[PDB]
Symmetry: D2
Subunit: 113 residues, 4 copies
């Protein structure tokens, strides 16, 4: 799946591979929810399950800093942090897509069902 | 596949479904090369083949105008037109991704092999 | 030393009267304001105050869209960077945003 | 009536000395120039000349990246719109660009 993240690299013209993604959910403060790394295709499947993914405000943080530093590029953003309310009118499936540059990022959401 | 196009809609939070995509190749003027429509997932596979996709300058035109008009939205851009040299140092596979808004578009490329 | 600009990709206009909050990591509130008629927010800080460190610029996009009658995806366009004149620009759509920094 | 601005997302700077060509559909060349130190190109046209119609703004991004020693994907960031003050902004990366219009 109900939460998928896809990341692309604007500098290299590739997927952003092995980038850390942390998801938090807003507590009664940000409580850890799930995390993972992108695959060779830039995708991260299997973050969560239908049973774990409840209504709430979620924060997806993509660790852009480590990713650029590891490629020998200077990162401006510390991380790319997408915050949204999920499932408020019923369960949906979300894809969070992000395009990364050293001084910019773009992000969109696809919401289904 | 060697040329794939993926389109997303920033207004509706969905794939851009059934959007016309025309590809031209620069002639000895823009000669028609291939065209198609995006699927229910926003993707257009099967534009061309390894044997047809030669070196050249290619223009991918995404018909944003028809797409917005059909949804009852006012389009500013007539079309989103990505122009690139392909295969100059050998065959590669290209994915052209585009994110559409009425007054803006973002596009990136993923290049493999 | 720090300017924020916000643009609306759906209407093709500056995003007016948008709340912008800036935090510095000790998140200490650091500066805030509302966008002008041009989509720009000047006068956030001073050179004396704006020291190197890690800043978050949080733009209240949700309130913006809701005032226009459009249901938005995000709570805010939130933007986190290490410092060390900065213009932070945000381009808004209901289900998307892009941000950049020009230094 | 028509301004073009170009930003570099890799270096976090204005894109300086970039060629910009504007065409009007009869493609008739209509206006052109090079970006200034601020990444902006003013003085392209006049209110008398800038009539409603379909315009292409073509930004010579390839030459820009090549001067910096970076191999670029695109030939140009080309941008096509129906008119009817316009600022057309382009944010450049080697394998990507975003463009917007603020009217
Ligand atoms: O693989 C995808 O579905 C995909 C990933 C990223 C994008 C994207 C394009 C431009 C800006 C931001 C994101 C589009 C499609
Ligand atoms: O008017 C400006 O200064 C400006 C316009 C657009 C952007 C921009 C931001 C994100 C994506 C594309 C363009 C930045 C600055
Ligand atoms: Ca609810
Ligand atoms: Ca060759």
């Amino acid at each position: 799946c109900p939460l998928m993240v896809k990341v692309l690299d604007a500098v290299r013209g590739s997927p952003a591979i092995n980038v850390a993604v942390h998801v938090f959910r807003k507590a009664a403060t940000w409580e850890p929810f799930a995390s993972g790394k992108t695959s060779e295709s830039g995708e991260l499947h299997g973050l969560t399950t239908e049973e774990e993914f409840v209504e709430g405000i979620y924060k997806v943080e993509i660790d852009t800093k480590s990713y650029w530093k590891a490629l020998g590029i200077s990162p401006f953003h510390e991380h790319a942090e997408v915050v949204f309310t999920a499932n408020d009118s019923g369960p949906r499936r979300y894809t969070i897509a992000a395009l990364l540059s050293p001084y910019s990022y773009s992000t969109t959401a696809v919401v289904t069902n």
